[PDB]
């Protein structure tokens, strides 16, 4: 049944195991420096992490 078929697909790789950190989005991910974050909410909450824009 579904109790033993919950793990029919191994979620060890791909977009299924690597979802977004904000609202579980599956597009536009940033895996760089351990964010696992979508780009738009990174832009939304990237000013209060101790950041000022220079270039």
């Amino acid at each position: 049944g579904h109790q033993q078929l919950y793990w029919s697909h191994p979620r060890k790789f791909g977009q299924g195991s690597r979802s977004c950190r904000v609202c579980s989005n599956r597009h536009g991910l940033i895996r760089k420096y351990g964010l696992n974050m979508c780009r738009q909410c990174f832009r939304q909450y990237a000013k209060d992490i101790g950041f000022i824009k220079l270039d």
């Binding site: 919950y6 950190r21 904000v22 609202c23 579980s24």
Partner: protein
């Protein structure tokens, strides 16, 4: 509800010592990060707390993965009416 009886009672036994617990939102994971000494389905746990919120015994709010439930006076009253503890004792959220 499709959960074992001893697991549910152990969940409110965990909630006796505290006034809140964390739980991630996922429908394909059987493991609990907070409670690790025994097997418990956290899917059924968050279903139990959303049923408790539906009948109006506890609150619930969202922050990006996790639901947060705050026990009130009627919540601990239903706790001591359900698992049948003496009303003199209180949870440890008031020990200041």
């Amino acid at each position: 509800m499709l959960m074992p009886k001893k697991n549910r009672i152990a969940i409110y036994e965990l909630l006796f010592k505290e006034g809140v617990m964390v739980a991630k939102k996922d429908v394909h994971m059987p493991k609990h990060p907070e409670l690790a000494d025994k097997n418990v389905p956290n899917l059924h746990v968050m279903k139990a707390m959303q049923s408790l919120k539906s009948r109006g015994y506890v609150k619930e709010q969202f922050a990006w993965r996790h639901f947060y439930w705050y026990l009130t006076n009627e919540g601990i009253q239903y706790l001591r009416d359900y698992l049948h503890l003496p009303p003199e004792i209180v949870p440890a959220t008031l020990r200041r």
